[PDB]
Symmetry: C3
């Protein structure tokens, strides 16, 4: 069964939590966290081909619409889900008030980012991660192929259908393998939370426990208040959605890599019957743009620091968190650290840099339990993609 | 229309030239030169696949000849076109005499095994070579693959011949698809172009005065006379209509001028070779090769710079052994890469050949004057570097 | 003919040996060793595709067995071949006793991996990366996984799935095939390539094989010869395969491996000898690349006979007892040692700190620098046996399945 995951997740959360309370953070890290990393190694392996392949073959569907409309749909969808997510985490940090005790001890060109979506060598872009420029190209290829196939010349249309196939052969094959790599997941998962529990979990106490609640409640309320709602309204069964997306949420949670989860996310989109036309473009894009769980986490962390330091958090202009949280979320990468790291950009937005070494002394507190906040946050980052995809998949 | 390029090129050259006279070199650079770079990003994207694919499928044609003869032809073609080009630039710099005023201010200054270059043509990992630019080793391998494919298809075993034809197809699928795209990316060209000369005009253009204007003339007149005196002529004699050639190569010459990347123009140069009906067997090998070997417009620029410096410093430019420019210019040209600066950079090698290095900090004070308007000289020089590939390809395409 | 190789190897060994006795180590290196390197460049070129392709198509054959059994077989084969090889080189260095004269001159001086963070590295994180940056091993791991997913994709109820899948599998074979076509052409260069390659090593390190260095060399090559006759010829004979047909077939791989000293660079030529002696891509296209970095038999001997050379010149008792700890670590070091044309030297260090005599104690570091003075001589021999052991094992296991 795939409750062997929950058997691993629960057993591991427990076995983990215990062993780290007894100073064996290092019996774990040296002994258990390779099996958790192995699992990840595998899932990374599949991300590059599965993404490329499935997007070329996902330029099956209509050039100007689908893509055009679907992009714009999903983009618009993504923005509002994220712009909401922070506001929800603002409200969570006005509710829980994480910062009384005084912070104890002390001690990119934007444009030259947009241009970087258009690769300069697509084999480069392939061989060095780089989902986003890959996406951009994989699309352009898959479209040129469509047009090649409706050529009058039938040597053109011969080879073109040829190519398009092998590419699908691959995309398909990746999907075949994401099934096998899921067998490891119970062990993979067990080992992964075993670590984070026996490590940062035995540190979630006092005001750190306070902030953690303010996050995860916010994350829960993102789902029920936004996803379940937006699903319900759009006529899709929320509860069927969860049942199907169980596998991606668990990987995303446990891995904390949105980008690492992508194959498993994409195979959940396949096996809930959406078109490669949609999912194979919305998913990778969203996998780095729709960080809903980050925008909450960042909105609730800006507050945590500005409370321990005791600014008024502008009773007025804290929309400039909301704004910058969005912006930072969009920027934050899909690796299992960067929301912390990027939180900085929404901090210098509220005017409290990691230079004023009390700020830097709270932020370092936060960072002490990031991988805890990460799991939750990540899982919601991914879910937001599936929701959005699914919603837009039903609109088209 | 593709006169929207000329509408962009002329509007941009003007809008540019003006704004840079009014100290807005930075309103441009921050606001207009991304659109120009976007265009380039795109064209870079295509170069790697288009080059690889088209050459494997361009090992359609006859193994020993075609390739063999065509290589040798185009190589021989390339050498003499370049060896001429410098001599034409020598004559331009004896004509215009760019160096009376003494290289005034001093102080603002500047800092390969040959064999371990030839060996570097044979790649050690063809996916490496692919994923890291590297046209030349790619070419080498793409050929070798394209040939092994031909031979695989005439195998007695028909599972061998099944899969082989299969592979060769998808590869063509791609090569084809790239060509489809170089058509789309051409749509951007008018904006792309407008922005790209908007920059160079509003930047180094408002600096082309006095003896800098003098050297520019002696280059561009030399570049014009490379066309009329060598291309138009070598085209006419070989029976191809010059004026149909220019009409067809209007797109590659405009990209190359505006981009200044020989190598970045390659897809558009290769889709001009296709749509003037030459064989992938020829063009998909002569074009990439020449795109980094047949720098004619460089060898002129370098011959006419060596003279500009040795005039401002006032050496006799050896009344006798300035053939050692001619020789080294060739050698430098061959070497100079297809990126949008290196003719300047490489000019150094022909300077230390005439015996005046960038150490003697008056030399390095002229050479830094030159470098002040290089992108002006680059547009010109680059366009001629590409044209010379088309000319030679076309000429040799007609001989075979 | 392919005796134009032997005509080049012999002419070159001679022309080389002579010119380096007359201080023209640099007339050679500047003039002859490019043609030797060109040859290598080419063979490198083919390695990546040939390996990848042939393994995906090599996941023709049965998923659970073949692979399963063949792996375990070849793995088990490999261990014992190597574990023997050192013991043979132990015995060679008890026989020839290379270390009387005290390590003269001190002051040559060199400096001094997480295992688990090696195993994890076999599973690539981006297969295009792995491909584009050498990295045979993770490539293997993935190429298999691909080739198997392909097999299963082809027996799908959906026949659009089974359409494109067979499509893909074909082009991949188109390539594999095409590489093999080319390893034939690149063999044409071999006589020149070979001539130039030994021309170098002879006119360079060969005019240095004198005295105790000649002593150790003998103790190596005799050990290497006796690895063949005593182990290969034997294990071949017993398994019913004709040794002398095997040698006839593997003549081309052995000569490249010897002359190139790159086990990994020889791989196309080795893999095309496996093809043209009629083994399945199912076997050879997995056992050959794996072994090309794991089955270093000629290394484990060289390393066992080098530990002894140094421990003799320094005069330790070489533990009359626990020198099995060489045997053990030599295996481990052999397994680790890469297929590039130096690393047995470099890795010998790990079996030295195992016997407790590091390159810090600068007389150790003054012997090890003597060894290294003639490594490329020991390398040719050692390497060729590293490859042979792959063919032997492949062939043996190829006949078992
Ligand atoms: C910030 C503008 C948002 C518009 C959406 C288009 C997607 C571009 C976002 C790029 C951010 C990714 C960061 C690069 C990570 C790697 O390196
Ligand atoms: C100079 C000899 C000419 C013979 C023609 C063979 C082609 C080799 C020329 C190589 C020059 C290219 C410069 C390398 C640029 C990159 O890096
Ligand atoms: C030493 C353990 C042996 C078990 C066999 C499994 C294969 C793993 C061996 C990895 C050694 C290769 C060295 C890495 C070279 C590169 O980098
Ligand atoms: N690990 C997170 C990123 C973050 O920490 O912000 C994710 O992939 O969603
Ligand atoms: N940018 C030129 C090189 C040069 O300026 O010499 C070209 O690529 O053609
Ligand atoms: N050159 C050897 C490695 C070594 O010298 O240990 C080989 O490839 O087999
Ligand atoms: Na996401
Ligand atoms: Na993000
Ligand atoms: Na050129
Ligand atoms: Na050049
Ligand atoms: Na080996
Ligand atoms: Na090894």
């Amino acid at each position: 069964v795939l409750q062997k995951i929950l058997i691993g997740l629960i057993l591991g959360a427990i076995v983990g939590l215990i062993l780290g309370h007894y100073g064996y953070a290092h019996a774990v890290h040296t002994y258990v966290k390779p099996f958790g990393d192995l699992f990840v190694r595998l899932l990374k392996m599949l991300v590059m081909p599965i993404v490329f392949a499935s997007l070329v073959v996902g330029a099956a569907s209509i050039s100007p619409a689908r893509l055009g409309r679907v992009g714009v749909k999903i983009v618009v969808y993504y923005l509002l889900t994220s712009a909401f997510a922070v506001t929800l985490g603002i409200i969570m940090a006005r509710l829980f008030n994480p910062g009384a005790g005084i912070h104890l001890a002390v001690g990119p060109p934007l444009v030259h980012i947009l241009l970087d979506i258009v690769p300069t060598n697509p084999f480069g872009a392939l061989a060095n991660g780089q989902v986003l420029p890959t996406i951009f190209f994989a699309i352009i290829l898959g479209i040129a192929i469509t047009y090649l196939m409706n050529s009058e010349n039938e040597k053109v249309r011969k080879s073109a259908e040829t190519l398009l196939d092998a590419i699908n052969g691959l995309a398909e094959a990746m999907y075949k393998i994401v099934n096998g790599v899921m067998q490891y997941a119970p062990i993979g998962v067990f080992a992964l939370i075993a670590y984070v529990m026996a490590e940062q979990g035995v540190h979630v106490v006092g005001e750190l426990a306070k902030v953690t609640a303010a996050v995860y409640v916010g994350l829960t309320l993102q789902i029920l208040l936004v996803y379940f709602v937006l699903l319900k309204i759009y006529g899709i069964d929320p509860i069927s959605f969860i049942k199907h997306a169980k596998d991606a949420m668990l990987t995303a949670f446990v891995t904390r890599s949105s980008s690492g989860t992508l194959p498993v996310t994409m195979r959940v989109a396949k096996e809930m019957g959406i078109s490669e036309g949609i999912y194979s473009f919305t998913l990778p894009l969203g996998a780095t743009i729709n960080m809903d769980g980050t925008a909450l986490y960042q909105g609730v962390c800006t507050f945590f620091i500005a409370n321990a330091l005791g600014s008024h958090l502008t009773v007025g202009q804290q929309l400039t968190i909301v704004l910058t949280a969005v912006l930072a979320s969009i920027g934050t990468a899909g690796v299992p650290g960067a929301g912390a790291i990027m939180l900085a950009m929404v901090l210098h937005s509220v005017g409290l840099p990691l230079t004023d070494p009390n700020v830097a002394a709270a932020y370092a507190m936060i960072l002490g339990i990031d991988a805890i906040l990460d799991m939750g946050r990540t899982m919601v980052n991914v879910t937001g993609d599936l929701t959005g995809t699914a919603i837009v998949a039903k609109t088209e």
